[PDB]
Amino acid sequence: ARSGNALPLLREIAEHLHHLLETGEASTIDLSALPLTPGDLEWLRAELGGGEVSVTLHAGASTLDETAFPGVWWIIHRNAQGAVTTQFIEVAFVPELVKSPRADVAAARAALVLRMADL
Template identity: 35%
Template sequence: MMSFPIPVVAWKPDIGPGSQPLEDEILNTLDVQSDVYTFRPPLTELNAPPEVVAAAMDFLRLLLASLRATPFSVSQPLRFSLLPLEPAVRDEINELLGVGEVSVQTGGDLRAQETAFTGIWRIRGDGVDDVEAGAFPSALRNLALARAFPSAAPVEPPLDLMNAPALYHEIRTLSAQWTAGRAAHVINLSLLPATPDDLAWLDEQLGRISFSILSRGFGNCRITATALPYVWWVQYFNNMEKLILNSVEIIDVPAVALAAVEDYEETTIRLAEWIESLESAL
C-alpha cells in the first residue's frame, strides 16, 4: 500500500477552527428556489345543484376509465370536448379538477391550464373547450411547431460584443437544421461569460413571439418561444423575482413543461382516490 505522509504544521493562532470570531457571522447561500409543487386535492364545496354535480361526476368517471384503458402517448393524447355540456356542468368539472402548476398563453385566444392532476389539461379558445390527457396540449404544441424560419439574413453584430455573435450563429444554425423529436440542446447562459450587452443583443436577434409557458413545479420557471423554430428561452426565478438560471433550449417543447408517463400513472391513481372521496361526500 502506498504511504501518504501527512505533513505536520505548527499551530498558528490565526488559522484553523476557532481561530476566527463568530459574532455577526453571515452565512451566504445560493439564491435557489425553495418552493416545490406538491399535489393537493382541489377545494370544492359541491354546492351546485345535484343534477349538475351528477353530470360532472359522470365525466370524471369517464375520464378515469379512459386513462386506465389508454396507454400514455405524446402523439395521441386523450381528448374530450366539453362543448356539448351545459355551462354549469363545465364550471363544476373545472372546480372538481382544480388548477395545477403549468399554464400556457398565446397571442390569440387559445390557452391551456394544467389541472391539479398532472397531465390533465383544460384547453380553451374560440370554439374550443377541451379536457386533454397527455404530455402537453396537442393544439398548442402544433402551434409552437408552426413557427417558420426567418428568410432575412442575420444582421452584423456590434464590434464590442463578446460571445453573443457566436452563440447566435450556433442557435440559428441548429434551428434551421432541427427536426421534431430530437433530444434537447441546452445552452446555459448563466455559466457562460456574457455581458449585459451580449444578452440584450441575443434577445433582440432571437425575438419573442406571443407564446409563453409558466411552470411552478419547482419555483417559477418562465418559458418563452423565440421567433426561431424550436428555440425557447427557459428562465428560473426565485421568490424575490431574481433570475437564477438563464438558458436557451432547442427542442419541440422544453421538458419542464411536459407531463411524463410516471405523472400519467400517478394521476390515474389520484383521480380514482378523488372520485372515491367525492362519492363518499355526496
C-alpha cells in the same frame, strides 16, 4: 458594453436547430457558460425576438418563452422573490420541462380514482 460572444451563440443555436430537425434531439445552451454582459444577453434577446407562446412553470418560477424563431425558447428561472437565478436557450419542438412525465400521469390517474371515492 458587448463582449462579441453573442454571435458564436447564434451559430450554436443554428447548429442546434439543424440537429433538432435531423435527429429530433432537443438541446439546451446554458447562458452562464460564457461571460456575457447585460449587453450580450440583452443583444441576444433582441435578435431572437418574441414568439407567440409563453409558458410559466411553477416550482420559484420559470418562464419559457418561444422566440421569434420557432423551436428556439428563452428560459428564465427565478427564485420565489422574483430574482433571476439562471437563463438558458432550449432548442426543441417544446421544452422538455413542459411535458408531463409518464410516472406522474400514472400517479395522477391513481389520485383521481382515490378522489372519486370521496365525492
